[PDB]
């Protein structure tokens, strides 16, 4: 996360860290939607251009974390995966359209002060909150900058980062990139004339774009960090997978594999 | 700084799972009866040039020697040896050995297997090939610094036979030197002369040697290559290097981006990367997936494995993180060679009739190699950076854990160097 | 009531947790607000 700040403890209890099992390394973000299902970006698991094509056995998820690298004994929960499910219409060749995937935990996880699921939006909530100007929140342990600092690096945070960003009008998103945008993705970020900044960066993919409902005061995951063109650049915006538009797929996968 | 970078002990963590106790293991029954013979035939020779076939076998010997040598140091020690130097020294020394003493050497060094490979191959071919190889590696400059000394030193009271003196010189561009180990002035003049000949690279060649030594092998090598794709210096930053499942240490980490060959080996559970040096030589970096997987990697390394890795690699743009380091070792290979089966040679009763008419006892085979690895290299390799960027972690080959490295001369398939970096902060 | 959450999945395949989703133990449950959620509420200030 670029231009964000340290999250507070338990601020994003549905935050999941996707980990390579062996060798051990942070791969992406993800989110907890129940005691056995995790949601993430499809390209975090399958992306040929980078020779990525993981299976259930190559991964691990770390739930309930705050610190990026410390093993948080009796607070975080480490789980293996039973199965991975990528959207059948996921398009990694052109625009990462339908960049979404589900991962089923090998064993249900217990909830606690640090582990709790986020809600998935219903049609009305999505229709009311997904509008230009409304702000959402993005969290992650990805890099703090796009550019390299001589003899230091791009910068990694010690704890979970968070940043609030406004949803942007389709026309402006469309005019900001030569990439072909679809109805299954939306973009967020500040306009150059707005002064404030912030964005997701390398390593934040898969993490959730959430909004707190003013109708029932519950947190909803409206999007999944997907892609961009450089982090925090003026006139550019981050793109997120439109979760509600793919809710039917999520429901299908869970219905025939959940039990 | 105020943060811990913890390795996760998965077995320990998951052993606390509730269903751990419900595991159903296998009983070791009365009897079974089964097996599968061996025979590590060398069908690796097909299409291989004459010099490559000899180097494939020299490599086979090198890995066996490494296997023995590593069990004589700590698992946390770095290791560095120059296999080609060891093999040529034994080839050279065998010029004056006879009988079984000679046979053990040719057998264990795998020279016997080479002569057997083809009908047109004879012991003379070995010496001829070493003569050619030696010239190419040390008597020519291809773009890297490779300084070396590989001679015999025989106490003056034991005159060296003429035929040996001249053969060593002709086939190995080396010398069987007269020496006086009990004379400090000899040590000084000699160390000094070697320094001048090696332009200051190889120093203290004959230091700390028993004054009663009758004969010893001196093999010192200095190496420093230049990267084809150099590591830009602004990318060099401190990075955590994982020593083991519990400790980490900050080291200078070099970083770059370019098209490099690499592969993921599922059989030996490791990642392999190839880095090109100017002059037709390359460094092969092998990092096991699990830190506890180093012992099995070392245990199964063979020429066949290396060829399998080489064919399986693919070229792709990737970021590379390699710690800079400098290894300087000084071993006495006698004990190791004995364990491999070469014993008569190191016993006074061994037959070295070809070297001297007197009985000589060899107790020291000094093998001292030095290698420096830093960001120096020719240059560039475009500093691209564009648009479309999926936001997951990118493809990088990160050498931040104990690794092995093999340095090969491409044209001859010669294993120049082999090492293990368990800790880049030490030498 | 419209302020009450309505479940959409079947706990038999979804697992437990939907009914109480989106309510943080260390925040909503304790009647505490995080340091920047207010900024989100203020942006929803209509459309
Ligand atoms: C890696 O992903 C799959 C493996 O998950 C690779 O191949 C397919 O694997 C599945 C089993 O998981 C089989 O059902 C298919 O038949 C396999 N395809 C075949 C026969 O080639 C796949 O090749 C790799 N990457 C891609 C492109 O998905
Ligand atoms: C060794 O090789 C030669 C041919 O080069 C052959 O005559 C001899 O039988 C071989 N010995 C064996 C069986 O290894
Ligand atoms: C791919 O291209 C690079 C750039 O020249 C080269 O160094 C590398 O060896 C190539 N890989 C293959 C297939 O040899
Ligand atoms: Na922006």
Å from CA of B262 to ligand 1 middle: 21
CB of residue B315 inside a 6 A radius of ligand 3: yes
Beta bridge partners of A221: A210
Q: Backbone phi, then psi, for A13, in 5-degree steps?
A: -65, -10
Alpha-carbon distance of B409 to B146, in angstroms, equals 12
Pairing of strands B270-277, B281-288: antiparallel
> With contact defined as beta carbons under 8 Å apart, do A78 and A126 qualify?
no
**Cα B238–Cα B244–Cα B245 angle in degrees, nearest 5:** 110
Q: Backbone phi, then psi, for A193, in 5-degree steps?
A: -80, 0
Alpha-carbon distance of B288 to B270, in angstroms, equals 4
What is the number of other CB atoms lying within 10 angstroms of the CB of residue B333? 23
Residue corresponding to tokens 């929803």: C44
Alpha-carbon distance of C34 to C23, in angstroms, equals 12
**Long-range contacts, B232-235 (Cβ 8 Å, 24+):** B232/B256, B232/B375, B233/A151, B233/B375, B234/A148, B234/A150, B234/A151, B235/A148, B235/A151
Alpha-carbon radius of gyration of chain A: 17
> With contact defined as beta carbons under 8 Å apart, do C36 and A162 qualify?
yes
Alpha-carbon distance of A75 to B154, in angstroms, equals 69
> With contact defined as beta carbons under 8 Å apart, do B106 and B90 qualify?
no
In what helix (H) or strand (E) does residue B283 lie, and over which residues does it extend?
Answer: strand B281-288
* DSSP string for residues in B328-369: E--EE-HHHHHHHT--GGGSTTS--TTT-SS---EEEEEEEE
Distances A130 to A125, A240, C43 between C-alpha atoms, Å: 8, 12, 12
DSSP A232: S
DSSP A154: S
CA-based nearest residue to A15, from A63, A61, A59: A63
Residue corresponding to tokens 């439109």: A242
> With contact defined as beta carbons under 8 Å apart, do A230 and A199 qualify?
no
Distances B225 to A118, A250, B278, B315 between C-alpha atoms, Å: 55, 55, 7, 22
How is residue B102 written in tokens? 């000679």
* DSSP string for residues in B116-159: HH-TT--HHHHHHHHHHHHHHHHSS-SSSEEEEEEEEEEETTSP
Close Cβ partners of B255 (under 8 Å, ≥ 6 residues apart):
B231, B235, B236, B237, B319, B320, B321, B322
End-to-end CA distance of chain B: 25
Residue corresponding to tokens 């219905």: A255
Alpha-carbon radius of gyration of chain B: 24
Alpha-carbon distance of B5 to B246, in angstroms, equals 9
Ligand nearest to the CA of B316: 3
Based on DSSP, count helices (H) and strands (E) in chain B, helices before strands. Answer: 11, 16
Q: Where are the alpha helices (DSSP H) in A138-242?
A: 170-176
Distances B362 to A159, B105, B327, B349 between C-alpha atoms, Å: 61, 14, 27, 11
Beta bridge partners of A166: A135
DSSP A70: S
How is residue A170 written in tokens? 């389709």
Pairing of strands B145-155, B215-224: antiparallel
Question: Counting Cβ atoms within 10 Å, is residue B127 exposed (0-12), middle (13-18) or buried (19+)?
Answer: buried
Alpha-carbon distance of A100 to A217, in angstroms, equals 26
> With contact defined as beta carbons under 8 Å apart, do C38 and A214 qualify?
no
Would you call B25 an interface residue with chain A, using a CB distance cutoff of 8 Å?
no
What is the number of other CB atoms lying within 10 angstroms of the CB of residue B122? 12
Distances A94 to A66, A86, A179, B75, B207 between C-alpha atoms, Å: 34, 17, 8, 48, 66
In what helix (H) or strand (E) does residue B314 lie, and over which residues does it extend?
Answer: strand B314-323
Are residues C22 and A213, on separate chains, in Cβ contact within 8 Å? Answer: yes
CA-based nearest residue to A8, from C29, C31, C38, C26: C26
What is the number of other CB atoms lying within 10 angstroms of the CB of residue B279? 18
- CATH fold of C1-47, please? Epsilon-Thrombin; Chain L (4.10.140)
CB of residue A55 inside a 6 A radius of ligand 1: yes
In what helix (H) or strand (E) does residue B192 lie, and over which residues does it extend?
Answer: helix B184-197
Alpha-carbon distance of A188 to A200, in angstroms, equals 10
Strand locations in chain A (E):
5-6, 15-20, 25-32, 37-40, 46-47, 52-53, 59-63, 77-79, 81-86, 101-105, 135-140, 161-166, 185-188, 208-212, 219-229, 238-242
3 state SS for B293-313: HHHHHHHHCCHHHHHHHHHHC
- Chain A with chain C: Cβ pairs closer than 8 A: 119
Q: What is the resolution of this structure in A?
A: 2.2
Alpha-carbon distance of B261 to B131, in angstroms, equals 32
Distances C25 to A13, B162, B197, C33, C34 between C-alpha atoms, Å: 9, 90, 75, 11, 12
Alpha-carbon distance of A45 to A60, in angstroms, equals 12
Alpha-carbon distance of A17 to A11, in angstroms, equals 15
Are residues C3 and A251, on separate chains, in Cβ contact within 8 Å? Answer: no
* Residues A60-74: b if buried by 16+ CB within 10 A, e if exposed: bbbbbbbbbbbbbee
Q: Backbone phi, then psi, for B97, in 5-degree steps?
A: -105, 150
Alpha-carbon distance of B204 to B196, in angstroms, equals 12
Reduce the DSSP state of residue A257 to 3 states and report it. Answer: helix
* Residues A25-57: b if buried by 16+ CB within 10 A, e if exposed: ebbbbbbbbbbbbbbbbbbbbbbeebebebeee
> With contact defined as beta carbons under 8 Å apart, do B79 and B402 qualify?
no
Neighbours of chain C (3+ CB pairs under 8 A): A
How is residue B131 written in tokens? 């003569």
Q: Backbone phi, then psi, for A46, in 5-degree steps?
A: -140, 115
Based on DSSP, count helices (H) and strands (E) in chain A, helices before strands. Answer: 3, 16
Whether cis (ω within 30° of 0) applies to the bond prior to B342 is: no
Q: Which of B261, B312, B408 to mutate to test the pocket of ligand 3 (most atoms within 8 A of CB)?
A: B261
Alpha-carbon distance of A214 to B166, in angstroms, equals 95
How is residue B325 written in tokens? 């380091």
Q: Which of B39, B41, B116 to mutate to test the pocket of ligand 2 (most atoms within 8 A of CB)?
A: B116
Alpha-carbon distance of B406 to B81, in angstroms, equals 10
Residues in chain C: 47
DSSP A193: G
> With contact defined as beta carbons under 8 Å apart, do A35 and A64 qualify?
no
> With contact defined as beta carbons under 8 Å apart, do A105 and A61 qualify?
yes
- Chains C and B contact (Cβ–Cβ under 8 Å for 3 or more pairs): no
Alpha-carbon distance of A119 to A132, in angstroms, equals 21
How is residue B27 written in tokens? 């009983």
Which residues from A are below 8 Å from C27, CB to CB?
Answer: 10-11
Beta bridge partners of A223: A209, A242
Q: Backbone phi, then psi, for B317, in 5-degree steps?
A: -70, 130
> With contact defined as beta carbons under 8 Å apart, do A126 and A161 qualify?
no
For chain A, domains (ranges, CATH) are 1-12+118-244 (2.40.10.10), 13-117+245-257 (2.40.10.10)
Residues in chain A: 259
For chain B, domains (ranges, CATH) are 48-225+325-373 (3.30.497.10), 226-324+374-424 (2.30.39.10)
Selected for mutation to probe chain A from B6, B252, B391, B400 (highest A CB count within 10 Å) is B391
Reduce the DSSP state of residue B316 to 3 states and report it. Answer: strand
How is residue A171 written in tokens? 């026309």
Alpha-carbon distance of B394 to B113, in angstroms, equals 46
Are residues B390 and A200, on separate chains, in Cβ contact within 8 Å? Answer: no
Residue corresponding to tokens 């690499």: B262
Taking the CA of residue A4 as centre, how many other CA atoms within 13 Å lie in the half-sphere pointing to its CB? 34
Distances B193 to B137, B184, B201, B298 between C-alpha atoms, Å: 22, 14, 12, 38
């Amino acid at each position: 996360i670029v231009e964000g700040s340290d999250a507070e403890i338990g601020m994003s209890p549905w935050q999941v860290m996707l980990f390579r099992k062996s060798p051990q390394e942070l791969l992406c973000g993800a989110s907890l939607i129940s005691d056995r299902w995790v949601l993430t970006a499809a390209h975090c698991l399958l992306y040929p251009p980078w020779d990525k094509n993981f299976t259930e056995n190559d991964l691990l998820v770390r739930i309930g974390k705050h610190s990026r690298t410390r093993y948080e004994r009796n607070i975080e929960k480490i789980s293996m995966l039973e199965k991975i499910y990528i959207h059948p219409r996921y398009n990694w060749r052109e625009n990462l359209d339908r960049d979404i995937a589900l991962m089923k935990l090998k064993k249900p996880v217990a909830f606690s002060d640090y582990i709790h699921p986020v809600c998935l939006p219903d049609r009305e909530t999505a229709a009311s909150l997904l509008q230009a100007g409304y702000k959402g929140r993005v969290t992650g342990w990805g890099n703090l900058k796009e550019t390299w600092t001589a003899n230091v690096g791009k910068g990694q945070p010690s704890v979970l980062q968070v940043v609030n960003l406004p949803i942007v009008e389709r026309p402006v998103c469309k005019d900001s990139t030569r990439i072909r945008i679809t109805d299954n993705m939306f973009c967020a970020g500040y306009k150059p004339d707005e002064g404030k900044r912030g964005d997701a960066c390398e390593g934040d993919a898969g993490g959730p774009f959430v909004m707190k409902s003013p109708f029932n005061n519950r947190w909803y995951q409206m999007g999944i960090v997907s892609w961009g063109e450089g982090c925090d650049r003026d006139g550019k915006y981050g793109f997120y997978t439109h979760v509600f538009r793919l809710k039917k797929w999520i429901q299908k996968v869970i219905d025939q594999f959940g039990e | 700084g105020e943060e811990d970078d913890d390795y996760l002990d998965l077995e320990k963590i998951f052993s606390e799972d509730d269903d751990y106790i419900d595991i159903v293991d296998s009983l070791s029954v009365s009897p079974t009866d089964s097996d599968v013979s061996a025979g590590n035939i060398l069908q690796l020779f097909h299409g291989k040039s004459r010099i490559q076939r000899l180097n494939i076998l020299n490599a086979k010997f090198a890995f066996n020697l490494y296997r023995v040598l590593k069990d004589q140091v700590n698992t946390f020690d770095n290791i560095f040896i120059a296999p080609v130097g060891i093999s040529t020294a034994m080839g050279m020394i065998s010029l004056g050995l006879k009988g079984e003493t000679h046979e053990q050497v040719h057998s264990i060094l795998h020279f016997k297997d080479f002569v057997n490979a083809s009908s047109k191959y004879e012991i003379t071919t070995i010496h001829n090939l070493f003569r050619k190889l030696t010239h190419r590696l040390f008597r020519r400059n291809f773009g890297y610094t490779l300084r070396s000394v590989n001679d015999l030193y025989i106490q003056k009271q034991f005159p060296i036979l003429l035929d040996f003196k001249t053969k060593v010189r002709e086939y190995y561009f080396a010398e069987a030197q007269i020496a006086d180990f009990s004379d400090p002035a000899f040590i000084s003049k000699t160390n000094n002369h070697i320094m001048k000949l090696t332009k200051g690279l190889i120093k203290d060649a004959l230091e700390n040697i028993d004054p009663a030594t009758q004969m010893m092998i001196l093999n010192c090598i200095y190496f420093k290559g230049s990267w084809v794709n150099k590591f830009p210096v602004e990318m060099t930053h401190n990075h955590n290097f994982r020593l083991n499942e519990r400790e980490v240490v900050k080291v200078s980490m070099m970083q770059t981006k370019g098209n490099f060959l690499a592969a993921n080996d599922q059989e030996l559970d490791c990642d392999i990367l190839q880095l090109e040096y100017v002059g037709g030589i390359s460094m092969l970096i092998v990092v096991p997936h699990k830190m506890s997987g180093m012992k099995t990697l070392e245990a199964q390394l063979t020429p066949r494995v290396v060829e399998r890795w080489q064919k399986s690699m693919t070229n792709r743009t990737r970021e590379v993180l390699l710690p800079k380091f400098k290894l300087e070792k000084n071993y006495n290979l006698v004990e190791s060679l004995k364990l491999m089966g070469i014993r008569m040679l190191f016993d006074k009763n061994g037959n070295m009739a070809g070297i001297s008419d007197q009985r000589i006892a060899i107790d020291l085979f000094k093998h001292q190699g030095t290698i420096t690895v830093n960001e120096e290299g020719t240059q560039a390799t475009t500093v691209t950076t564009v648009g479309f960027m999926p936001l997951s972690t990118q493809v990088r080959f990160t050498v931040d854990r104990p690794f092995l490295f093999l340095i090969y001369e491409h044209r001859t398939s010669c294993l120049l160097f082999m090492g293990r970096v368990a800790n880049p902060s030490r030498s | 009531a419209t302020s009450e959450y309505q479940t959409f999945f079947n706990p038999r395949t979804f697992g437990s947790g939907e009914a109480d989703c989106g309510l943080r133990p260390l925040f909503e449950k304790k009647s505490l607000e995080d340091k920047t959620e207010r900024e989100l509420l203020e942006s929803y200030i209509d459309g």
